[PDB]
Design a protein around this ligand. Structure first.
Ligand SMILES: [Mg+2]
Ligand SMILES: [Mg+2]
Ligand SMILES: [Mg+2]
Ligand SMILES: [Mg+2]
Ligand SMILES: [Mg+2]
Ligand SMILES: [Mg+2]
Ligand SMILES: [Mg+2]
Ligand SMILES: [Mg+2]
Lengths: 250, 202, 233, 244, 220, 238, 245, 204
């Protein structure tokens, strides 16, 4: 028994948890995914990996999840593992709603799911979940917010960030082309197709090789929607059909 | 109810009425109160129908496994023990008055009584159920040692007939069954077949 | 006296891969092939039941199993693992009905069973299921076809294949057929995509097929099978 | 792949790079360890169980030496492989069967019993704490409207019904024999079914055994109760095969 | 409630009134009391409505799971067993009085199960507050091997006896016939009760109701 | 070494090293001796001191009025077993109002200490025991080892260099049964002395004696109390 | 055959060739033990054991390898004594529970199948190790006659007319086959048991020894008892004298 | 009795392609009024409302716990609960407390989310459901309410002749019940709109 146990929750001589780091690896190979924060909205854009001419796909999305009524999120990693952490996310939301009769503060729904992943790394002898998530939503405390979580049970709020493939080239890009304080859901969707066109081994980044969803206020009730095929391409062409116009300036 | 069992040389005779009431309403005037526990072992039931049925199925299950496991005909004493164990253990939650009679390749014909308390005792012949109170004197003055599968089979027929006559909680048809090495034969006594006794007149 | 292993038997390697899951899929890729087609007007499942070792009684066991009155299954991989999942799906199907009084929506049954399969990739003392399933159903007008594999991940297909030559069996369908295919049509293009690898004399006992139209799910008899076989019916 | 190994895929029931379970396989070889072979055949009006009865010692009450077990009165079986494991599995079968009737009201179908025992073994195949059982089980009896049934379950979880089958050392030789005689298949009567079974075992073991060297179990549509042939009447079949 | 069943030549017939009461007031003029177990097995329920529902639904559900594995068709003894062993286990707290009937490979079977868990195997049975009334019909006019129609009406006659003679029973008479090859679930089978024809007019004309607050909301 | 760390692992030779290793714990402990006449059971033991400023270790413990023991091996395990032994005795008196038959108590130690030798993750008790008691079957001297095995003895000794003591006891057995107490104790003290380096012997500081018998409840003697027995020694073979 | 590359550390692991080395290893422990034999006479079962003299300091009766598992059942053991003793408690408990439940003395075949399944339970997991012992169960009754069973570390159980376990399992058998127990009476078998013991016992290697004899048959009235000192001595003399030939 | 501790009345009616549901507004403890604005009808999706009568605490609790379940159901399923299904959902939640039930007998009123189908039903405090094509009542004046209903309900009714009908049933029944009243509220649901009016009633 002692012989077959891999010790998934032990410290390494360095002082790090190797099973967490290996989960990361798996993440940095999954469909790219990112979200940017505006002032009138917040969004999520992900590299639709279930791209193939035979799938019948009958869902609102493939990597976009509705949690709260004021929240939604996206994942990067093991999908099954993700279906588990989201389901639990929905439950934590409702338990809060039952108990307080008010939508759960965005960050709080995150610290919640994080304490669970953190646990899977301190005890139990189980492997952590191979998932990293992006959370976007609105709450009467900080309105629009974007959050990111690691299988380490770690998180942070980002004005803009990315997860998944080339989740490095995506950062630095936004890290400089981001309007820190002057973003519109439009100027946001801007970098969206711009950065996804980059970090995504795809030429002319087709409408399918992507999934978009945006969250905004609107006369009280929060609104969550995933752009329709057409609505997508508008930003597809807009990007390029403006890029060739950008080289007529050089 | 009125149940009864008698031991004769190579076997046993078992009798019971067919009445099962709830208050003063007969919910079944044709009940079968003689339940097969194993190939040659039977039990008569009196008390809570639900309790006696539930207990009997349990013993049948217990005994069937025991015999296959031993690859041998089960003892009558064993079957009695399994009833006694459940009836003693759950005596506060059961209302069962049971008689176990059957044939044993090792002990022959036998009859055991397992009344309310959960006690178990072997007897030449046993009687149970509400109606039994009206046939003690009868049964005590009539029982003869050395009766035949016929005398016995007739002896219980009279006792059950008498008891059914006086007890409101007993009546219907008289069911019988004789068990001996050869096997088990069950018969029924409808209307006229039921012994009769003239109601005293002027 | 038995205890239990509480540590998970599946763990990330440095490559970030979940080794046991890949290997599970390998058991799948090595199993009798299966095809599923969503005929926009129903769905068909068929697999290679090549047992009949002259002594095997093809009847006694099936690979195309009914979950509910309107759901159905087939697999590719380890038979015994399948059986376990069949009993759990059927069970999950009832726990839904008792609560809601409405037959379980095919997508929902898939999600539930997928969760189970995922469970066996993290819980202690166990190995992932060495199987992949193709669930078909008629829930609310539209026909559905899904596949969930060892990882516990699932997808909806218009049609596909799993098992031996699933690579070729897919590409074949990747063109050898398309939507709008009516009932009996999708059935033919399915038994055909099967033969595209079925080594031997593909008879009515070498295969088994089930269909799911918006009027219940069922298995086709050796008769209706022997028929479609003659390159028609 | 191609016989590769990684980690403990050879010590506990976990997948190998190929997607195999060596422990389940090692479990099959374990069956042959007993050095015995068993055959079962399905007649049109009955089912037959036949196995070796190697009793090299005169100090054993040959009576206590068997591989033929009465599960129910209408269900009989033959075990092949590691003994203790076998008795165990037999006891579980007896249990699952007695329980089925108590809980449902009717004798368990030979079909179901085997599927049950099978499902159980499947766990040992997915759980690492314990090893699979190194034994094989063949059950036979008459169904309500399906007549005689013959089923066998694996130390791997597989189970199935057959016209006839075998297990043990000469399982693969016994199948080739039977499947060849099931084509020429005359009228599968009680005598032929019994006769065909004996020879299959005698020729694959090339023995022409005495009446004490084998044991025969049978269930009949006219006598559904499982029956184990006497040494006497076993010979009655042996002599009958010698008339030619 | 009045529920009954009879065993005839080709199968079984189940009856049942349709009244449901909350105390001495009629809550439902049309309750469905004959429940579906398996395609060849049906059960009438009397007692605590909710209990009669859930127990009946559970055994059904468990039998669909059962035959879904055996591949055969459910037997009556099985429904009887499952039901009785559960009820017994709850020592009478699950107030379900059942009339179970169906056709087996072994034939048509009619069982009566009480809330405490005992059962009766009989050619004809009744349960519910109207059971004594119904049982009278049977005891007076019962014959073995009746023809479908000769039974199909003996049962509607006993469910009728209940309906009129027991304040706990009323409304319609539902039926269920199950034979070796047929299953006629005759919902309204008879309807000997009609609401008296309204002799006046009371239709509330728009505007008669003084309002204190209004608020609309458009859908899509 | 694949067969050395778990008591659930048999070696290809039909041995269980963990058990053997635990037995080694006994050998390390200082030697102790036990012997009985036909009316008395006697325990004798040599106590060790870590440094000169520390006291000598207890080696003899009182179990019940008719039972006492001497220990060798892990002290913590001795206390566990002693307390089990004490508890078992208290129970006997409580339920039956009679002292627990020494042989029956020994069977319980046997059963109790066997369990852990067969379960994964568990370890054998690391202590040997000499048990001196007196029941309605007379005096008794038992021995119990890390392997759940136990022995009924005429006389015995476990510990470091206990081989000498055993040898001395084996030579004067026939004498024991008829010895009167003080003589019996001397044979004990004498045997113990056998296990020592020639350039040293029994001190009233390192000897402990335990006596139980038809005429006396188990009693222990430790310092000045040991003098009376040390007086009238023997030359001590030079 | 030297198989053992991890394949011999857990009872929950099969060797590449279908073996459970832990169980096999447990049996070796038994093969290294001193010989014990059982023989079914016509009116009972007789037990004899070569209980080696561990030390002259030990009492006669120490380390008994024969116990009463029930008043009508005897148990003869070989191998790791502590393991055997716990198996003796299980046997006792099993026989006691049976009486409490079914209300009559347990049939030797059942007590044997039961204990055997308990033994077997310990050969499937890594959580525990197989018993390093083998034992025989002997009983007599008029409705069952004489019965002799033997269970080993794997759980296997069988009925015998004569049987031996230990150092000289083989040597003891070839000597038992010389007797025609089926027709022999228990009172005469004692002699033969003690005889086969001295023959088989290795005068060289194994030093001095003691003889343990168990009783059970019509001669004991169904109660398994120790053989009376008187019979033992006679049987010892007969064995020693027959040795000088 | 426990049920009449807070008093209260609830009713649902079936029109042609519309549905109505009304409830008194009093929240009292025995004889004493405590509040006049007590919600007893809760929105469980558009075109679907549930009305809870009975013990105040369980009214609130059964509703809150039901929402909990309704929301997740809608997040897992990719839809909006169908009336017959919400009824079965409440039937399950109540019966899970079979031997220590919530003291409330619910009333469900709504239109099919993907159809015209008007739907109404009521339940047992232990979850037994009842579906009808006319009306359903619950509360401390079941009898009064049945009185009106069996004399004012007509098979088919336009939204306005339904509103005027259910509004009369309430106000008049509730006015012959001492612990029900303090105002009535009505909800009329049409495929297109939701009309919500608080009728003019007695305040004693
Ligand atoms: Mg396949
Ligand atoms: Mg394993
Ligand atoms: Mg074994
Ligand atoms: Mg001899
Ligand atoms: Mg003897
Ligand atoms: Mg609305
Ligand atoms: Mg008022
Ligand atoms: Mg007032």
């Amino acid at each position: 028994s002692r012989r077959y146990d891999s010790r998934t929750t032990i410290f390494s001589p360095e002082g790090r948890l190797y099973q967490v780091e290996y989960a990361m690896e798996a993440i940095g190979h999954a469909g790219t995914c990112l979200g940017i924060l505006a002032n009138d909205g917040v969004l999520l854009a992900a590299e639709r990996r279930n791209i193939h001419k035979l799938l019948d796909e009958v869902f609102f999305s493939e990597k976009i999840y509705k949690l709260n009524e004021d929240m939604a999120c996206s994942v990067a990693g093991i999908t099954s593992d993700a279906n588990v952490l989201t389901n639990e996310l929905r439950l934590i939301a409702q338990r809060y709603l039952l108990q307080y009769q008010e939508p759960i503060p965005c960050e709080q729904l995150v610290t919640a799911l994080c304490d669970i992943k953190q646990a899977y790394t301190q005890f139990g002898g189980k492997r952590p979940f191979g998932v990293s998530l992006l959370y976007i939503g609105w709450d009467k405390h900080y309105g629009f917010q974007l959050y990111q979580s690691d299988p380490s049970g770690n998180y942070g709020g980002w004005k803009a960030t990315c997860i998944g493939n080339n989740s490095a080239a995506a950062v630095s890009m936004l890290k400089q082309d981001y309007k820190e304080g002057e973003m519109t859901l439009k100027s946001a969707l801007a970098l969206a197709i711009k950065v996804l066109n980059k970090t995504m081994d795809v030429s002319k980044l087709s409408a399918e090789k992507v999934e978009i969803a945006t969250l905004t206020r609107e006369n009280g009730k929060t609104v969550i929607r995933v752009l329709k095929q057409k609505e997508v391409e508008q930003l597809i062409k807009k990007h390029e059909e403006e890029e060739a116009k950008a080289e007529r300036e050089k | 109810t009125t149940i009864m069992a008698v031991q004769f040389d190579g076997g046993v005779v078992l009798g019971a009425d067919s009445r099962t009431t709830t208050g003063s309403y007969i919910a079944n005037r044709v009940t079968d109160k003689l339940t097969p526990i194993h190939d040659r072992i039977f039990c008569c039931r009196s008390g809570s129908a639900a309790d006696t049925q539930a207990v009997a199925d349990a013993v049948t299950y217990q005994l069937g496994f025991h015999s296959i496991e031993l690859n041998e005909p089960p003892l009558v004493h064993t079957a009695a023990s399994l009833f006694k164990e459940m009836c003693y253990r759950y005596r506060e939650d059961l209302m069962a008055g049971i008689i176990i009679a059957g044939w044993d390749p090792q002990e022959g014909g036998q009859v055991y009584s397992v009344p309310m308390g959960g006690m178990m005792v072997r007897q030449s012949f046993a009687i149970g159920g509400s109606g039994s109170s009206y046939i003690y004197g009868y049964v005590d003055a009539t029982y003869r040692e050395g009766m035949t599968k016929e005398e016995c089979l007739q002896f219980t027929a009279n006792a059950l007939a008498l008891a059914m006559e006086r007890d409101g909680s007993s009546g219907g048809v008289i069911r019988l069954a004789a068990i001996a090495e050869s096997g088990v034969e069950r018969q029924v006594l409808l209307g006229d077949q039921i012994p009769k006794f003239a109601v005293a007149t002027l | 006296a038995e205890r239990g292993y509480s540590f998970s038997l599946t763990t990330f390697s440095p490559s970030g891969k979940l080794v046991q899951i890949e290997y599970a899929l390998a058991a799948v890729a090595g199993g009798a092939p299966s095809v599923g087609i969503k005929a926009a007007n129903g769905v068909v499942l068929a697999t290679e039941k090549k047992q009949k070792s002259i002594l095997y009684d093809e009847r006694s066991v099936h690979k195309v199993e009914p979950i509910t009155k309107h759901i159905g299954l087939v697999y590719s991989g380890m038979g015994p693992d399948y059986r376990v999942l069949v009993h759990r799906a059927r069970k999950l199907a009832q726990q839904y009905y008792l609560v809601y009084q409405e037959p379980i929506p095919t997508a929902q049954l898939v999600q539930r069973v997928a969760s189970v399969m995922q469970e066996y990739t993290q819980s202690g003392g166990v190995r992932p299921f060495g199987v992949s399933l193709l669930i078909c159903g008629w829930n609310e007008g539209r026909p559905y076809l899904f596949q969930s594999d060892p990882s516990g991940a699932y997808f909806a297909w218009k049609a596909t294949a799993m098992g031996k030559n699933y690579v070729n069996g897919k590409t074949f369908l990747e063109k050898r057929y398309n939507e709008d295919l009516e009932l009996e049509d999708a059935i033919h293009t399915a038994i055909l995509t099967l033969k595209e690898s079925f080594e031997g004399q593909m008879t009515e006992d070498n295969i088994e097929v089930g269909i799911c139209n918006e009027a219940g799910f069922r298995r086709l008899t050796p008769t209706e099978v022997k028929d479609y076989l003659a390159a028609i019916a | 792949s191609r016989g590769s190994s990684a980690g403990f895929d050879r010590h506990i029931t976990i997948f190998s790079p190929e997607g195999r379970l060596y422990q389940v396989e090692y479990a099959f070889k374990a069956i042959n360890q007993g050095g015995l072979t068993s055959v079962a055949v399905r007649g049109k009006d009955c089912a037959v169980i036949v196995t070796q009865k190697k009793v090299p010692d005169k100090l054993l009450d040959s009576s206590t030496v068997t591989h033929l077990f009465k599960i129910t009165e209408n269900i009989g079986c033959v075990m092949t492989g590691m003994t203790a494991d076998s008795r165990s599995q037999v006891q579980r079968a007896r249990y699952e069967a007695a329980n089925w009737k108590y809980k449902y009201g009717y004798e368990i179908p030979v079909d179901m019993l085997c599927k049950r025992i099978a499902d159980i073994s499947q766990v040992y195949t997915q759980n690492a704490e314990m090893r699979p059982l190194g034994c094989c089980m063949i059950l036979i009896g008459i169904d309500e409207e399906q007549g005689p049934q013959v089923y066998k379950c694996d130390p791997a979880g597989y189970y199935c019904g057959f016209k006839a089958t075998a297990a043990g050392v000469k399982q693969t030789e016994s199948t080739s024999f039977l499947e060849k005689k099931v084509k020429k298949k005359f009228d599968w009567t009680f005598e032929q079914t019994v006769e065909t079974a004996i020879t299959c075992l005698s020729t694959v073991l090339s023995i022409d055994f005495k009446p004490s060297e084998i044991e025969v179990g049978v269930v009949t549509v006219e006598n559904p109760k499982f029956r184990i042939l006497t040494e006497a009447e076993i010979d009655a079949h042996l002599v009958a095969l010698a008339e030619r | 409630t009045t529920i009954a069943g009879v065993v005839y030549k080709d199968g079984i017939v189940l009856g049942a009134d349709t009244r449901a009461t909350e105390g001495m007031v009629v809550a439902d003029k049309n309750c469905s009391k004959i429940h579906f177990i398996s395609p060849n097995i049906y059960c009438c329920g009397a007692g605590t409505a909710a209990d009669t529902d859930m127990t009946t639904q559970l055994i059904s559900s468990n039998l669909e799971l059962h035959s879904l594995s055996t591949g055969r068709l459910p037997r009556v003894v099985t429904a009887n067993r499952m039901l009785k062993q559960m009820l017994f286990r709850y020592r009478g707290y699950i107030g379900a009085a059942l009339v179970l009937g169906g056709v087996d490979v072994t034939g048509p079977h009619l069982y009566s199960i009480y809330p405490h868990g005992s059962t009766d195997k009989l050619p004809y049975v009744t349960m519910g507050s109207g059971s004594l009334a119904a049982m009278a019909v049977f005891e007076d006019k019962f014959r073995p091997d009746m023809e479908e129609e000769e039974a199909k009406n003996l049962v509607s006659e006993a469910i009728a006896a209940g309906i009129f003679n027991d304040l706990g029973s009323g409304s319609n008479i539902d039926l269920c016939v199950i034979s070796k090859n047929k299953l006629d679930f005759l919902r309204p089978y008879t309807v000997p009760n009609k609401k008296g024809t309204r002799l006046g007019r009371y239709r509330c004309e728009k505007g008669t109701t003084a309002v204190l607050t209004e608020k609309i909301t458009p859908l899509e | 070494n694949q067969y050395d760390n778990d008591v659930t692992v048999w070696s290809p030779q039909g041995r269980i090293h963990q058990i053997e290793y635990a037995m080694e714990a006994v050998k390390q402990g200082s030697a102790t001796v036990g012997l009985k006449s036909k009316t008395h059971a006697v325990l004798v033991a040599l106590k060790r001191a870590q440094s000169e400023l520390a006291a000598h270790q207890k080696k003899i413990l009182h179990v019940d009025n008719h039972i006492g023991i001497s220990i060798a091996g892990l002290t913590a395990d001795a206390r566990l077993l002693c307390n089990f032994m004490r508890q078992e005795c208290l129970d006997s008196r409580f339920v039956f109002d009679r002292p627990l038959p020494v042989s029956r108590l020994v069977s319980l130690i046997g059963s109790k200490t066997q369990i852990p030798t067969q379960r994964y993750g568990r370890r054998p008790y690391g202590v040997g025991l000499l048990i001196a008691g007196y029941d309605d079957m007379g005096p008794h001297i038992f021995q119990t080892c890390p392997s759940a095995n136990y022995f009924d003895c005429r006389a015995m000794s476990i510990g470091a260099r206990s081989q000498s003591a055993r040898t001395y006891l084996e030579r004067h057995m026939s004498e024991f049964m008829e010895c009167n107490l003080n003589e019996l104790v001397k044979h004990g003290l004498r045997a113990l002395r056998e296990t020592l380096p020639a350039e040293q012997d029994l001190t009233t500081k390192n000897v402990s004696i335990g006596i139980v018998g038809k005429d006396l409840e188990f009693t222990i003697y430790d310092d000045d109390d040991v003098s009376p027995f040390l007086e009238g020694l023997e030359e001590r073979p030079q | 055959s030297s198989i053992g590359t991890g394949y011999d550390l857990s009872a929950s692991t099969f060797s590449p060739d279908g073996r459970v080395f832990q169980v096999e290893y447990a049996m070796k422990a038994v093969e290294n033990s001193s010989t014990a034999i059982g023989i079914r006479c016509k009116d009972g079962v007789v037990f004899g054991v070569e209980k080696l003299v561990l030390s002259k300091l030990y009492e006669e009766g120490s380390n008994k390898r024969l116990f009463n598992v029930d008043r009508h059942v005897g148990m003869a053991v070989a191998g790791l004594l502590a393991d055997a003793r716990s198996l003796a408690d299980i046997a006792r408990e099993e026989a006691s529970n049976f009486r409490s439940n079914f209300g009559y003395n347990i049939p030797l075949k059942h007590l044997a199948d039961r204990v055997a399944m308990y033994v077997h339970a310990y050969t499937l997991y890594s959580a525990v190790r197989p018993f390093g012992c083998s034992f025989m169960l002997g009983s007599y009754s008029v409705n069952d006659g004489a019965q002799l069973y033997m269970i080993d570390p794997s759980g296997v159980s069988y009925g015998y007319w004569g049987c031996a376990i230990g150092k000289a399992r083989q040597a003891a058998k070839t000597e038992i086959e010389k007797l025609q127990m089926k027709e022999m009476t228990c009172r005469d078998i004692v002699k033969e048991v003690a005889k086969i013991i001295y023959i088989v016992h290795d005068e060289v290697k194994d030093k001095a020894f003691e003889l343990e004899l168990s009783w059970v048959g019509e001669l004991t009235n169904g109660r398994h008892e120790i053989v009376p000192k008187d019979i033992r001595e006679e049987a010892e003399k007969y064995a020693k004298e027959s040795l000088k030939e | 009795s426990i049920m009449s501790y807070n008093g209260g009345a609830v009713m649902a009616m079936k029109g042609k392609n519309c549905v109505a549901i009304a409830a008194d507004r009093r929240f009292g403890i025995q004889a004493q009024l405590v509040t006049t604005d007590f919600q007893k009808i809760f929105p469980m999706g558009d075109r679907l409302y549930i009305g809870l009568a009975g013990l105040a605490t369980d009214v609130q609790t059964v509703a809150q716990r039901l929402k909990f379940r309704l929301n997740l159901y809608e997040l897992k399923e990719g839809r909006q609960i169908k009336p017959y299904t919400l009824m079965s959902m409440v039937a399950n939640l109540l019966y899970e407390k079979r031997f220590g039930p919530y003291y409330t007998e619910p009333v469900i009123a709504g239109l099919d989310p993907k159809t015209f189908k008007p739907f109404i039903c009521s339940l047992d405090l232990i979850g037994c459901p009842m579906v009808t094509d006319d009306f359903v009542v619950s509360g401390t004046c079941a009898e009064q309410m049945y009185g009106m209903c069996e004399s004012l309900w007509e098979p088919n009714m336009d939204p306005d002749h339904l509103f005027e009908t259910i509004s009369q049933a309430m106000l008049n029944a509730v006015d012959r019940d001492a612990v029900s009243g303090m105002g009535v509220i009505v909800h009329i649901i049409e495929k297109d709109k939701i009309t919500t009016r608080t009728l003019k009633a007695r305040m004693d």
